[PDB]
């Protein structure tokens with residue numbers, strides 16, 4: 086894989102990221118807490134989002150212009166994307182009352198952390214702009230990158246807002262769980278930061294700043310992002326936690342999941358009442374009841390049929406909109422998620 | 424007052440700020456939640472930080488260059504400072520387990536809000552960069568302002584980190600509460616965003632971007648910021664909530680307050696044990712015991728003597744470092760806080 090070939094170097098750059106962010110002795114204790122937050126949260130993942138920056142940079146920039154300093158900036162912008170995601174996940178885990186993430190207990194669930202994690206999450210976000218300034222201040226794409234990361238934060242936060250509004254705690258209303266709402270949540274909430282942001286960063290780094298090029302790129306990447314969140318919802322309930330590294334909470338959290346949307350599209354009036362009585366509640370028995378209904382409506386086969394249809398749809402979109410970028414930029418990402 | 428003369432216009436500009444931030448129908452519900460967050464949080468205060476931008480702009484820019492569009496940008500950057508503070512306070516109220524703010528219950532304490540306020544706080548932060556782009560994108564000071572707001576967030580977050588580390592819940596250790604630590608907390612945590620940020624924004628807007636000018640300005644403004652946080656700590660316990668609009672929690676929160684620092688400097692071994700047994704705990708009786716010790720050590724008179732010494736010290740600093748800026752830029756702010 087083109088990701089496996091660049092992974093080792095990317096992960097080894099993390100030490101430099103941390104050292105640079107850790108180097109006024111009065112704030113030494115705060116800096117040690119930042120190091121602890123960085124090391125706990127921005128490490129233990131697959132680093133696919135950050136790697137997508139590095140890989141896309143190598144495919145878009147002329148090898149002659151891929152010098153030691155330009156590669157360093159690519160690895161740094163890659164780590165900036167991982168830091169953005171670390172910021173969102175630390176905060177999303179509090180708001181979703183999650184237990185584990187990347188095989189360990191959620192940072193806020195750690196004794197002595199608690200709601201202090203809210204500030205820790207904001208520090209991770211601040212670190213992006215610290216790194217963009219330290220490594221890209223003198224580059225012509227500097228402001229493009231600042232604006233792209235700020236826009237990515239706004240889009241995700243709007244998406245998280247739709248997510249929380251559609252999922253009110255202890256307010257069970259399935260009328261809100263529609264396909265139109267679902268696609269809107271995921272587009273803003275996941276698709277921009279997970280797929281548009283990494284490729285767009287490498288594009289700007291390669292001097293590709295044209296609105297039309299970014300629009301064409303966005304058409305493919307937002308559609309891949311939608312499949313990716315549908316996969317995330319599927320794995321929340323039917324995935325193996327020893328593989329996902331996290332425990333699913335969508336049913337207990339009354340989330341507008343792809344699965345509840347598909348359940349509602351296929352449920353008889355009798356099945357609708359079962360779901361109405363058991364969804365969005367903490368009881369193990371009620372959550373087990375919902376999973377049984379999903380299994381009875383054969384949603385895992387519906388997801389597998391969707392994964393196939395989605396893949397063929399995204400491939401058709403790469404054929405239509407990849408030009409003038411190398412199709413490999415999008416094919417490498419499509420192989421990693423499908 | 425130079426603030427009273429510009430207040431009405433500034434507060435009336437809020438409607439335009441909200442309309443511009445509220446104007447893709449799919450995200451309509453999220454936008455209505457953003458409007459609710461803006462209206463609840465960025466309104467009910469004294470708006471002194473945002474007003475400081477407007478007033479300083481008028482004193483630094485040549486009246487001939489103070490056209491309709493430039494004034495609009497000044498009111499917008501002023502509202503951006505209020506939005507930064509709204510972001511910090513919504514999150515600080517969760518982390519400090521506060522009850523009220525600006526005469527109403529804390530946004531997170533509202534039924535149906537809760538930990539969703541974490542995302543609401545991030546949306547308020549995102550709104551700054553939305554406004555800076557909509558109104559200052561074509562201005563030569565655009566990047567200066569972006570960097571100044573991002574640096575302000577980082578500084579405050581580092582300061583909040585020192586604050587939370589020095590105040591561990593249920594871990595009563597007075598050994599941490601030193602004057603060196605106190606000054607470090609407040610400098611990063613309050614002084615940069617409250618006093619440096621507003622004047623620096625107006626300076627950049629007036630084309631004053633010189634490092635030496637910003638350094639001289641910072642020397643006065645960080646010292647004013649220190650007095651202001653000392654005043655905030657004093658009012659936390661001895662202020663009138665019907666005037667402050669908020670209930671104090673520093674004693675129950677085990678905070679490194681200016682008052683606990685002064686108590687420790689003057690306490691006998693016997694008085695140290697009383698404080699050790701009663702500080703950083705929820706019991707009304709224990710909090711009453713701490714306030715009695717502060718009254719016995721005559722800390723309100725120590726604060727009044729400090730307010731006098733501080734004022735004379737800041738005035739001496741305006742004489743030394745105000746040039747070439749009009750001393751009125753700093754005198755107007757000193758009258759508002761002293």
Ligand SMILES: O=P(O)(O)C(O)(Cc1cccnc1)P(=O)(O)O
Nearest residue numbers: 173174177181241245274275317
């Ligand atoms: O990692 P998670 O919690 O499974 C998730 O994908 C995390 C996340 C955070 C922010 C934006 N998008 C996705 P969610 O949407 O809560 O299902």
Ligand SMILES: O=P(O)(O)C(O)(Cc1cccnc1)P(=O)(O)O
Nearest residue numbers: 511512515519579583612613655
């Ligand atoms: O408004 P508060 O809570 O009295 C305060 O001043 C708020 C605040 C928030 C962020 C940075 N600085 C001050 P604090 O420091 O918690 O005493």
Ligand SMILES: [Mg+2]
Nearest residue numbers: 177178181183
């Ligand atoms: Mg989650």
Ligand SMILES: [Mg+2]
Nearest residue numbers: 177178181248
């Ligand atoms: Mg979530």
Ligand SMILES: [Mg+2]
Nearest residue numbers: 317318321335
């Ligand atoms: Mg999930």
Ligand SMILES: [Mg+2]
Nearest residue numbers: 515516519521
């Ligand atoms: Mg507070």
Ligand SMILES: [Mg+2]
Nearest residue numbers: 515516519586
């Ligand atoms: Mg606080």
Ligand SMILES: [Mg+2]
Nearest residue numbers: 655656659673
């Ligand atoms: Mg206070």
